Design a binder for these strands. Structure first.
Lengths: 284, 247, 153, 133, 256
RNA sequence: CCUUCUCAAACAUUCUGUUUGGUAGUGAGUGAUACUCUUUGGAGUUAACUUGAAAUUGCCUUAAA
């Protein structure tokens, strides 16, 4: 009401003052009375993680705006980097509806669904003016959880991010984590083990699992911005392939999903292009 | 009821553009023909407005390079002239908040002088290109029943395999490759892609949003600059900063 | 702005020189009624704007006649709240502009001429005559039909 | 009595026949409109005439518009007496030059120089300014 | 080229004409007319060619101006960037040694706010004798300062180079302004055949000087533009034919 | 109720010089010679003084509603 007066006189610089001198509400007391505390919150954080990964993907409009989405991208890419550094990915399950994971973050196990990165789509039946409030609630919830998880590990929060790295991919390889052996057996699979993932495959669900089951990645997708010395495995999924190197192993990304669910390491004589597969199977 | 102020203003404002574009065209004719006795400047210039703002210059000398063109409403109270409006309908830009990739070359450059005040230009980055094509980007496609001219978002790669079989382009990530590399085809992929409906940085008309529009118009007037020069350097800007807002 | 201007003068004036004279001339409109009446009769004021409204009314009745006698180019702009806005008040009653930038000199002179043509030409009549002859519509129906029907069978 | 013809003086640059028509049409549809322009050099002399169709629509479009402040001008508009009428006022384009010559042969026009030189030396003697060569 | 005796006999007898037993200052003022085939075709020039001369005419102007009502004045137009850097005292320091003065210095803004309106623009500019203008600002001027200035040869702006490579330098302004002042004479090129020059007055300079002044201008202008005949005068007079050339004209059919 | 072309190379090192190109404008009125052309059809230049931006018929759309 007092801004409308400032504009409706005009008299702009008084409105520019009124913009600066104000105190936006925040939910910090209402988090820590609703969840007291950390095992109770890590119960319900399951429900938060779906919607942040939903709202991170979808494109900016009226009824949404960019800042809400660019919050959610950063809050999720924080959560991935904790799970990738500290290595908690026990069950994987690719679906048609994106990709489900599972992660055992201090006792309780957390399922959550990343969608595939494809440009779709706003129906305009659904009410955003509810769901953005749920997002605003769960954004602050996951801030307080990530604050605790980072410092207890025990890295600095919030983590700074290298820009020239961010301009290659914008993802999990950006963000860098820093201070002030693992629970096994899935962590330290793919150790002393170097992947060269090809262009065609989805980088966004592969690099995550290869870093979170500690091994090194190089992507073809990175190269277009502008070594192959130490590379062991090459993930590729084309009908024909030409020419292939004698030292290198050639597999399809099915291999990575099948390996993690057992936690054995399967044989790589199976799989491989352009061959037919053994099926997939959920772990549930 | 039109009022005499606006109708006199629009005549004055158009006549500046019709004055301007003649100076652009006459310069470029003598440059392109090469009978250079009497002109203003010998070669083109590109200016990089970035964050009190820094303002470098370089001569172009191509060497092909990626640009991303966006309309930009403006300026204020001018009707488009047909030598400009022609070019915008070739590059498919018409209607605001609408992006497209273009290949910068010595032959193409003189077009960008003409559309300069109607668009905004610059070098994109691979994260921005990746962001655009898998938040947005929509194919016109035919087959299996129906009337035909229909807009579907890029879900399937089989559709990309079918309609770009002969080129050897498979899936979306190779579209992103073939845009970013400045390789063979390009133009077929870019015509295939269809131009990107971006959102308005600020919609509103409430008292919070009117401020953001006021603070925009200062920044937009500060960045975009109408020399009318004949030898006006084309302005490029941090699109990585821009497409944070617009995508 | 006033607060900012006080801080700036202390930094410059004590260290080098000046009596605040380093600061440039201020050009602005003059809003107080008493002040503007005082500005008139000097007579320094190029334009006066007088709001049509004002609750006393007697407050501003003399000003049109007073301006005429002195020969200030006065106007009667509509609304007092409008005058308030330009002068950072809720309501201003009168506003007079006594001085002008050299660039703005040309514009001011031609506005005054517009006002004389637009206001002063047609309003020799306005001094004369009495407003508010008008009747309510029910009474208008009654006078017209009686008068009209009496004339014509 | 007053006519339907109307005289508009004191016109801004880029108030031309296209605009005057498009504006003053909105009062009522008009027979003809013409702006005074320079020859030399094709641009306005800042006055024109219109003529409507009704008489009474012209004097309304006078009454609204007679001291109308517009750019750094104020438009003054008059209605003429009976008859008068829009007479002339040809819409001049800008006049481009052309180098029309030279038909006479060089040996002729050399003798024009040799003669018309000797005109000047005799002419300056008449003033009189005594001078050799 | 001309023989100087032909100039001396003309220009001294011009003193015998101009003496005899506004109007006084108009009547005595010299010109030199020069004719050619056709200057800069299908394109007007609002330039001024700065022709090389031994003696100034502005320094002689300054002394004779102090008596007269008209009052000699020099003007400098500069960029929006430049007037922040440059001041009055900085020009006043160096220009007094060789001995000239800049009267005022003007922003490119000030034409498009303070001396817009044409009364004010004429009343401003018709004061000044020598207008000067920054290389970059020059080409913006004839929209801004407007036509009535360019109708004269005086009040039309002369180009001057402020910038050393690259961005502003004071020395490059303040040393070059001397060259455009005292070493060089302004003249604009029209269309068509004719071209006069404001050479000078007659109170100013001596007849000993004027012949040396004319002789260098003739040797300048013959070589550039391929000329027909040259015609010195004072204002009232019938022309004095001092140079006259046929061998040009035989080219004129050969184009057609 | 719009806001005006606010630098470009090449040579050489003088603490920036020298050379070349880049500038369409308010309309109206006054007057005193000269020069170049064509054949009366007067076309192009030219020593300047008056003037309140003055005046009467030279024949794209969220910058919305």
């Amino acid at each position: 009401r007092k801004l409308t007066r400032a504009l409706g006189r005009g008299e702009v610089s008084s409105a520019k003052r009124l913009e600066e001198n104000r105190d936006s509400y925040t939910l910090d007391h209402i988090i820590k009375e609703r969840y007291p505390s950390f095992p109770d919150a890590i119960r319900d954080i399951d429900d938060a993680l779906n919607m942040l990964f939903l709202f991170s993907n979808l494109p900016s409009t009226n009824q949404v705006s960019s800042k809400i989405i660019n919050d959610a991208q950063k809050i999720c890419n924080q959560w991935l980097a904790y799970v990738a550094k500290e290595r908690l990915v026990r069950k994987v399950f690719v679906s048609i509806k994106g990709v489900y994971y599972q992660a055992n973050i201090k006792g309780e196990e957390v399922r959550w669904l990343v969608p595939f990165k494809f440009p779709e789509n706003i129906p305009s039946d659904v009410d955003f003016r509810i769901m953005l409030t749920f997002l605003e609630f769960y954004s602050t919830l996951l801030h307080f959880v990530l604050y605790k998880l980072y410092t207890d590990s025990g890295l600095i929060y919030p983590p700074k991010l290298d820009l020239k790295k961010d301009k290659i991919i914008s993802g999990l390889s950006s963000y860098i984590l820093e201070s002030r052996k693992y629970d096994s057996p899935v962590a330290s699979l793919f150790s002393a083990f170097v992947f060269y993932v090809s262009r065609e495959v989805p980088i966004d669900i592969l690099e995550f699992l290869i870093l979170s089951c500690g091994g090194n990645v190089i992507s073809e997708a990175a190269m277009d911005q502008i070594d192959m010395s130490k590379v062991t495995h090459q993930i590729v999924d084309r009908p024909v392939l030409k020419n292939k190197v004698a030292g290198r192993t050639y597999i399809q990304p099915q291999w990575i999903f099948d390996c993690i669910n057992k936690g054995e390491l399967v044989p790589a004589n199976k799989y491989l292009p352009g061959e037919a597969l053994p099926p997939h199977l959920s772990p549930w | 009821f039109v009022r005499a102020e606006s109708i006199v203003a629009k005549t004055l404002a158009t006549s500046r553009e019709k004055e301007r574009i003649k100076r652009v065209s006459i310069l470029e004719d003598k440059k392109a023909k090469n009978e250079t006795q009497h002109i203003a400047s010998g070669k083109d210039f590109i200016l990089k407005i970035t964050e009190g703002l820094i303002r470098e210059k370089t001569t172009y000398d191509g060497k092909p390079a990626l640009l991303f063109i966006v309309r930009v409403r403006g300026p204020l109270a001018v009707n488009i002239p047909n030598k400009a409006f022609k070019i915008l309908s070739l590059l498919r830009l018409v209607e605001t908040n609408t992006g497209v990739f273009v290949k910068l070359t010595k032959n193409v450059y003189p077009l960008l002088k003409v559309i300069a005040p109607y668009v905004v230009i610059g070098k994109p980055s691979l994260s921005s290109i990746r962001s655009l094509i898998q938040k947005r980007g929509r194919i016109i496609y035919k087959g299996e029943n129906e009337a035909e001219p229909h807009e579907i978002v890029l879900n399937d790669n089989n559709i990309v395999e079918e309609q770009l079989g002969d080129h050897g382009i498979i899936c979306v990530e190779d579209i992103i490759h073939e845009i970013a590399t400045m390789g063979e085809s390009f133009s077929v992929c870019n015509f295939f892609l269809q131009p990107f409906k971006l959102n308005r940085e600020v919609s509103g008309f409430g008292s919070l949003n009117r401020l953001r529009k006021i603070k925009q118009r200062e920044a937009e007037s500060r960045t975009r600059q109408f020399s009318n020069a004949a030898t006006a350097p084309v302005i490029e800007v941090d699109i990585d900063s821009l497409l944070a807002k617009l995508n | 702005e006033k607060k900012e201007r006080l801080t700036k003068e202390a930094a410059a004036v004590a260290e080098g020189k000046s009596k605040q004279d380093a600061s440039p001339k201020p050009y602005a409109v003059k809003y107080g009624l008493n002040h503007v009446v005082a500005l008139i009769e000097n007579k320094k004021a190029k334009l006066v704007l007088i709001a049509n409204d004002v609750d006393p009314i007697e407050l501003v009745v003399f000003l049109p006649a007073l301006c005429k006698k002195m020969g200030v180019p006065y106007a009667i702009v509509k609304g007092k709240a409008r005058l308030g806005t330009l002068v950072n008040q809720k309501t201003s009653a009168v506003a007079a502009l006594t001085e002008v930038r050299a660039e703005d000199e040309a514009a001011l002179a031609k506005l005054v001429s517009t006002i004389d043509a637009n206001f002063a030409d047609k309003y020799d009549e306005v001094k004369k005559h009495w407003g508010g002859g008008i009747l309510g519509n029910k009474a208008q129906a009654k006078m017209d039909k009686r008068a009209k029907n009496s004339d014509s069978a | 009595e007053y006519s339907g013809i109307i005289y508009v003086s004191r016109l801004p640059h880029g108030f031309h026949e296209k605009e005057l028509s498009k504006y003053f049409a909105q009062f009522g549809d008009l027979k003809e409109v013409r702006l005074a322009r320079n020859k030399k050099t094709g641009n306005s002399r800042h006055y024109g005439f219109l003529e409507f169709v009704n008489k009474e629509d012209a004097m309304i479009a006078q009454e609204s518009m007679n001291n109308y402040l517009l750019m750094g001008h104020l438009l003054q508009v008059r209605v003429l007496p009976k008859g008068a009428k829009i007479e002339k006022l040809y819409k001049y384009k800008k006049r481009v030059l052309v180098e029309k010559g030279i038909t006479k042969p060089v040996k002729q026009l050399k003798d024009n120089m040799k003669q018309k030189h000797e005109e000047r030396i005799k002419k300056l003697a008449k003033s009189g300014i005594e001078f050799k060569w | 080229a001309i023989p100087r005796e032909r100039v001396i006999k003309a220009v001294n007898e011009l003193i015998k004409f101009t003496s005899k037993p506004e109007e006084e200052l108009k009547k005595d003022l010299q010109l030199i007319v020069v004719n050619n085939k056709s200057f800069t075709g299908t394109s007007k020039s609002f330039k001024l060619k700065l022709l090389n001369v031994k003696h100034s005419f502005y320094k002689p102007w300054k002394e004779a101006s102090a008596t007269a009502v008209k009052d000699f004045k020099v003007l400098l137009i500069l960029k929006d960037s430049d007037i922040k850097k440059v001041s009055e005292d900085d020009l006043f320091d160096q220009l007094d040694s060789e001995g000239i003065k800049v009267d005022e210095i003007i922003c490119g803004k000030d034409l498009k706010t303070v001396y817009k309106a044409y009364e004010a623009r004429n009343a401003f500019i018709s004061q000044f004798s020598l207008i000067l203008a920054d290389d970059s600002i020059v080409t913006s001027l004839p929209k801004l300062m407007g036509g009535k200035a360019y109708n004269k040869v005086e009040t039309t702006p002369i180009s001057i180079r402020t910038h050393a490579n690259k961005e502003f330098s004071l020395t490059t302004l303040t040393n070059n302004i001397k060259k455009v002042y005292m070493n060089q004479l302004p003249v604009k090129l029209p269309r068509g055949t004719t071209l006069n020059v404001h050479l000078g007055n007659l109170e100013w300079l001596r007849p000993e000087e004027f012949v040396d002044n004319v002789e260098l201008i003739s040797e300048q202008l013959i070589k550039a533009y391929q000329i027909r005949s040259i015609f010195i005068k004072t204002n009232r007079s019938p022309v004095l034919p001092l140079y006259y050339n046929q061998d040009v004209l035989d080219e004129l059919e050969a184009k057609k």
